[PDB]
Design a protein around this motif. Structure first.
Motif, mmCIF file in Angstrom:
data_model
loop_
_atom_site.group_PDB
_atom_site.id
_atom_site.type_symbol
_atom_site.label_atom_id
_atom_site.label_comp_id
_atom_site.label_asym_id
_atom_site.label_seq_id
_atom_site.Cartn_x
_atom_site.Cartn_y
_atom_site.Cartn_z
ATOM 1 N N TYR A 168 0.778 -1.236 0.000
ATOM 2 C CA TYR A 168 0.000 0.000 0.000
ATOM 3 C C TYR A 168 0.805 1.279 0.000
ATOM 4 C CZ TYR A 168 -4.208 -2.636 1.023
ATOM 5 O OH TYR A 168 -5.277 -3.499 0.952
ATOM 6 N N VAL A 169 0.407 2.213 -0.883
ATOM 7 C CA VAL A 169 1.033 3.531 -1.040
ATOM 8 C C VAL A 169 -0.105 4.581 -0.965
ATOM 9 C CG1 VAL A 169 2.979 2.601 -2.360
ATOM 10 C CG2 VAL A 169 0.916 3.457 -3.561
ATOM 11 N N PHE A 170 0.330 5.796 -0.776
ATOM 12 C CA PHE A 170 -0.619 6.943 -0.669
ATOM 13 C C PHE A 170 0.177 8.187 -0.946
ATOM 14 C CE2 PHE A 170 1.669 7.386 3.092
ATOM 15 C CZ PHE A 170 1.709 6.124 3.703
ATOM 16 N N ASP A 171 -0.607 9.261 -1.150
ATOM 17 C CA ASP A 171 -0.056 10.605 -1.405
ATOM 18 C C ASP A 171 0.750 10.914 -0.137
ATOM 19 O OD1 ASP A 171 -0.931 13.234 -3.345
ATOM 20 O OD2 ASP A 171 -0.327 13.642 -1.241
ATOM 21 N N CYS A 172 1.968 11.355 -0.277
ATOM 22 C CA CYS A 172 2.828 11.665 0.875
ATOM 23 C C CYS A 172 2.279 12.718 1.835
ATOM 24 C CB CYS A 172 4.204 12.135 0.395
ATOM 25 S SG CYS A 172 5.059 10.753 -0.413
ATOM 26 N N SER A 173 1.331 13.502 1.343
ATOM 27 C CA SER A 173 0.719 14.564 2.157
ATOM 28 C C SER A 173 -0.440 14.037 2.982
ATOM 29 C CB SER A 173 0.225 15.723 1.288
ATOM 30 O OG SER A 173 1.333 16.482 0.812
ATOM 31 N N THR A 174 -0.741 12.772 2.817
ATOM 32 C CA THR A 174 -1.869 12.172 3.554
ATOM 33 C C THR A 174 -1.692 12.284 5.055
ATOM 34 O OG1 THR A 174 -2.512 10.615 1.804
ATOM 35 C CG2 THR A 174 -2.996 9.835 4.078
ATOM 36 N N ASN A 175 -2.815 12.502 5.724
ATOM 37 C CA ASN A 175 -2.928 12.560 7.188
ATOM 38 C C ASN A 175 -3.299 11.107 7.560
ATOM 39 O OD1 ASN A 175 -2.192 15.225 7.745
ATOM 40 N ND2 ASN A 175 -4.303 16.014 7.629
ATOM 41 N N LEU A 176 -2.330 10.430 8.179
ATOM 42 C CA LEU A 176 -2.571 9.013 8.529
ATOM 43 C C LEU A 176 -3.041 8.836 9.967
ATOM 44 C CD1 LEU A 176 0.736 7.685 7.034
ATOM 45 C CD2 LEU A 176 -1.566 7.233 6.072
ATOM 46 N N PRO A 177 -3.939 7.897 10.138
ATOM 47 C CA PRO A 177 -4.427 7.579 11.469
ATOM 48 C C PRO A 177 -3.323 6.968 12.319
ATOM 49 C CG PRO A 177 -5.866 6.607 9.791
ATOM 50 C CD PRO A 177 -4.589 7.061 9.118
ATOM 51 N N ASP A 178 -3.513 7.076 13.605
ATOM 52 C CA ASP A 178 -2.569 6.384 14.520
ATOM 53 C C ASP A 178 -2.982 4.906 14.534
ATOM 54 O OD1 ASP A 178 -2.719 8.970 17.031
ATOM 55 O OD2 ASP A 178 -1.504 8.871 15.221
ATOM 56 N N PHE A 179 -2.008 4.133 15.020
ATOM 57 C CA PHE A 179 -2.243 2.695 15.249
ATOM 58 C C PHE A 179 -1.810 2.394 16.690
ATOM 59 C CE2 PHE A 179 -0.963 -1.759 15.436
ATOM 60 C CZ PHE A 179 -2.132 -2.361 14.966
ATOM 61 N N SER A 180 -2.662 1.736 17.465
ATOM 62 C CA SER A 180 -2.236 1.411 18.844
ATOM 63 C C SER A 180 -2.616 -0.003 19.212
ATOM 64 C CB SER A 180 -2.818 2.509 19.779
ATOM 65 O OG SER A 180 -4.159 2.091 19.876
ATOM 66 N N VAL A 181 -1.830 -0.580 20.144
ATOM 67 C CA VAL A 181 -2.140 -1.945 20.660
ATOM 68 C C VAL A 181 -2.141 -1.841 22.207
ATOM 69 C CG1 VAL A 181 -1.349 -3.368 18.664
ATOM 70 C CG2 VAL A 181 0.238 -2.687 20.536
ATOM 71 N N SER A 182 -2.973 -2.628 22.840
ATOM 72 C CA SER A 182 -3.076 -2.653 24.321
ATOM 73 C C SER A 182 -2.315 -3.876 24.814
ATOM 74 C CB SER A 182 -4.554 -2.627 24.713
ATOM 75 O OG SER A 182 -4.564 -2.493 26.123
ATOM 76 N N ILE A 183 -1.285 -3.640 25.627
ATOM 77 C CA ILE A 183 -0.425 -4.705 26.126
ATOM 78 C C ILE A 183 -0.423 -4.693 27.657
ATOM 79 C CG2 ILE A 183 1.922 -5.848 26.100
ATOM 80 C CD1 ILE A 183 2.413 -3.610 23.654
ATOM 81 N N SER A 184 -1.097 -5.680 28.212
ATOM 82 C CA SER A 184 -1.138 -5.803 29.684
ATOM 83 C C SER A 184 -1.476 -4.459 30.310
ATOM 84 C CB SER A 184 0.197 -6.376 30.191
ATOM 85 O OG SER A 184 0.348 -7.777 29.980
#
Length: 323
Positions: free
Chosen positions: A245-261
């Motif tokens: 996957y690629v996108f326009d470099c100016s794209t506003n990307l969502p955060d990604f998070s994981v819950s660990i203990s």
């Protein structure tokens, strides 16, 4: 009790992180890899043409040969490397392993040939998965562990800036707040842990397992997770030239998070922008498919956000946001 700091440096786009390692007096630039347990290096046993653009180990100068021993690795991408084995003195950040097994390369596939940024790999996975036959060998870490002040190592990988590998001690100035520990499952030889949940932008889902892998550039997740993520990025499309996957470099990307203990490890959208895809006006996504392998790979993209403690007691992994 030994302790030491080795400095790591990202290559272009943070593709890999190299660290100098001295073997029998020669310094080589190796990729430290928590996803493998072999210490293999470019050597004088390779064809002279393949040795070009690398620092090579000369086994005959200082190594003790293990007659009849072999090693061999084949990767899912089609690369491979194999050769023979010597024992030598291996120094990493002032910590020296005497009689470490060194896997000298005799054959390497094109992808290793073409990568002049490193001269081999230093495996930091559990020794149970070392590939040396007839008797497997211990990793650098397992070899020196007992001599360290604490039987752990910690990593702070950074975005286009030098980072560190701390051997035998925790540098509390490298993270904020306190560490959150989770248990590791080393039954398959990896620093495998569980996440309770994930949040991809606006969508959350059930947890899964994955491995902490300094040797993998990206964050490799299940295709359902990948779709969910990129369904929230306008214009995201797959490009085999780029690698996913690629996108326009100016794209506003969502955060990604994981819950660990109980702890929320968050990868900010800005770190998920890997860089230019090297083909037109697009950027590569730091999140990509694990190709249905059955577990997630928490590669460099993920690790650039955290300070991570690899503790052989447990074993367990500690996490905190990088300072």
């Amino acid at each position: 009790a030994a302790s030491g700091v080795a400095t790591n440096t990202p290559t272009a786009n943070d593709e890999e992180y190299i660290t100098p390692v001295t073997i029998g007096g020669t310094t080589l630039n190796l990729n430290f890899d928590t996803g493998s347990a072999d210490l293999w290096v470019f050597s004088t046993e390779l064809p002279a043409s393949q040795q070009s653009g690398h620092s090579v180990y000369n086994p005959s100068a200082t190594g003790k040969e293990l007659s009849g021993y072999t090693w061999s690795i084949s990767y899912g991408d089609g690369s491979s490397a194999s050769g023979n084995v010597f024992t030598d003195s291996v120094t990493v950040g002032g910590v020296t392993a005497h009689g470490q097994a060194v896997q000298a390369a005799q054959q390497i596939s094109a992808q290793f040939q073409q990568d002049t940024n490193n001269d081999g790999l230093l495996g930091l996975a559990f020794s149970s998965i070392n590939t040396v036959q007839p008797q497997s060998q211990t990793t650098f870490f397992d070899t020196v562990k007992s001599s360290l002040a604490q039987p752990l190592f910690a990593v702070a990988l950074k975005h286009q800036q030098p980072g560190v590998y701390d051997f035998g001690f925790i540098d509390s100035s490298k993270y904020t707040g306190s560490l959150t520990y989770t248990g590791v499952d080393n039954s398959q030889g990896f620093w495998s842990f569980n996440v309770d949940s994930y949040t991809a932008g606006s969508q959350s889902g059930d947890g899964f397992s994955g491995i902490a892998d300094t040797g993998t550039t990206l964050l490799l997740l299940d295709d359902s997770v990948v779709s969910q993520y990129y369904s929230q990025v306008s214009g995201a499309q797959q490009d085999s030239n780029a690698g996913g996957y690629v996108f326009d470099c100016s794209t506003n990307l969502p955060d990604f998070s994981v819950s660990i203990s109980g702890y929320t490890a968050t990868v900010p959208g800005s770190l998920i922008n890997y860089g230019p895809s090297g083909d037109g006006s697009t950027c590569l996504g730091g999140i990509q498919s694990n190709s249905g392998i059955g577990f997630s790979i928490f590669g460099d993209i993920f690790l650039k956000s955290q300070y991570v403690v690899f503790d052989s007691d447990g074993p367990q992994l500690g996490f905190a946001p990088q300072a």
